[PDB]
Design an enzyme around this catalytic site. Structure first.
Site, short mmCIF file in Angstrom:
data_model
loop_
_atom_site.label_atom_id
_atom_site.label_comp_id
_atom_site.label_asym_id
_atom_site.label_seq_id
_atom_site.Cartn_x
_atom_site.Cartn_y
_atom_site.Cartn_z
N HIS A 175 -2.06 -23.66 1.16
CA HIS A 175 -0.91 -23.50 2.03
C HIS A 175 -1.19 -23.95 3.45
CE1 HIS A 175 1.64 -21.52 -0.89
NE2 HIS A 175 2.52 -21.20 0.04
N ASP A 245 4.31 -29.85 -6.84
CA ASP A 245 4.26 -28.66 -6.02
C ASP A 245 4.92 -28.95 -4.67
OD1 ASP A 245 3.53 -26.17 -4.77
OD2 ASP A 245 1.84 -26.02 -6.15
#
Ligand SMILES: CC(=O)N[C@H]1CN[C@H](CO)[C@@H](O)[C@@H]1O
EC number: 3.2.1.52
Length: 333
Positions: A175, A245
């Site tokens: 992240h 993703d």
């Protein structure tokens, strides 16, 4: 000549006029919802119907596996974590009841699928898949996930696997940082990839992780044609779609520009690009897909929900039995 699509993201309770004008583009094929888009169940139902009033061919997904991250809260059962089901004796039955329960509950609101379950293994190494991974043993998690997927299929929802080919060993988070996994080629076949090989025939959608495997391919697994075509499609006999993703977070900046991200993803073999939390990056990718004239893949309609779910799911024998079976383990609400 090539195929692809795009999954957008809105940052409001209702649709802005700008959101309506960017939906109508054919290159957009989906929408992800988060906490900022959710108020109450009926609010999400009219939000979905408001999007279907523009494009009834879109597919709407939610980040709902019931653990640390469960977007649908009020009006929905507190699903347990995947690690909370491992210790219980009859985990193969609680998985079917947990998968069916959450899939019917979200389909009755209006969404099509939910990115669940996660097939990663809990090596106590990655900080993102703490309680999300089922267990540490590969075959134990492959049987449990196959039962969870079995419940979603009984509910009418296509299951999505996360995260190919494995994210539990990657110590760095994707992240904010860039995860790197220098494990050998043959070891991944014996460890993290086992659940993906067992459920390749029982799965309809995959999500490659943004971890780097310098042993396999210098580029991340989501951008690797060796990972997606040579190993996944050519070797692991998988044939469903391959959801990229989130292409807006860190770890995906290896290729560079937001447009260049979906270029490298579609050229790698993925069927759909995922960009959220930023509208501008979604416009650059959309403009890119318009240039090379992408065609919506015929595999995407397999992911749309076939759910028989109405407001009726509260009155079915599976609803009462799964409520009691999951309530005994002190998991649900
Ligand atoms: C590695 C990981 O867990 N990525 C998440 C990024 N955001 C997506 C949209 O909510 C999720 O599907 C992925 O799980």
């Amino acid at each position: 000549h090539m195929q692809g699509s795009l999954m957008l993201d809105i940052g409001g309770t209702w649709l802005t006029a700008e959101d309506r004008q960017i939906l109508r583009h054919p290159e957009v094929g989906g929408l992800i919802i988060f906490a900022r888009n959710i108020e109450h169940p009926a609010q999400v139902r009219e939000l979905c119907a408001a999007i279907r009033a523009i494009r009834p061919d879109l597919l709407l997904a939610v980040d709902q596996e019931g653990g640390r991250v469960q977007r649908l809260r009020q009006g929905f059962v507190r699903l347990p974590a995947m690690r909370a089901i491992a210790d219980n004796p009859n985990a193969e039955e609680l998985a079917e009841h947990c998968g069916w329960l959450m899939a019917t509950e979200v389909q009755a609101v209006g969404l099509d699928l939910s990115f669940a379950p996660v097939l990663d293994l809990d090596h106590q190494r990655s900080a993102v898949v703490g309680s999300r991974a089922f267990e540490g043993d590969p075959e134990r998690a492959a049987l449990l996930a196959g039962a969870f997927i079995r419940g979603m299929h009984a509910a009418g929802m296509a299951a999505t696997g996360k995260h190919f080919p494995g994210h539990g060993w990657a110590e760095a988070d994707s992240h904010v940082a860039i995860p790197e996994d220098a494990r050998s080629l043959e070891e991944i076949r014996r460890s993290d990839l086992v659940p993906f090989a067992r459920l390749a025939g029982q799965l309809d959608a995959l999500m490659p992780a943004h971890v780097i495997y310098p042993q396999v391919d210098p580029q991340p697994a989501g951008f690797s044609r060796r990972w997606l075509q040579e190993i996944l499609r050519g070797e692991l006999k998988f044939d469903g779609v391959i959801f990229s993703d989130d292409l807006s977070m860190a770890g995906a900046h290896v290729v560079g520009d937001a447009a260049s991200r979906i270029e490298a993803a579609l050229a790698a073999g993925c069927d759909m690009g995922l960009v959220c939390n930023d509208r501008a990056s979604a416009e650059l990718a959309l403009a890119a897909l318009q240039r090379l004239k992408v065609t919506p893949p015929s595999r995407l309609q397999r992911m749309r929900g076939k759910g028989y779910a109405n407001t009726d799911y509260r009155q079915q024998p599976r609803w009462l039995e799964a409520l009691s079976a999951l309530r005994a383990a002190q998991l649900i609400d």
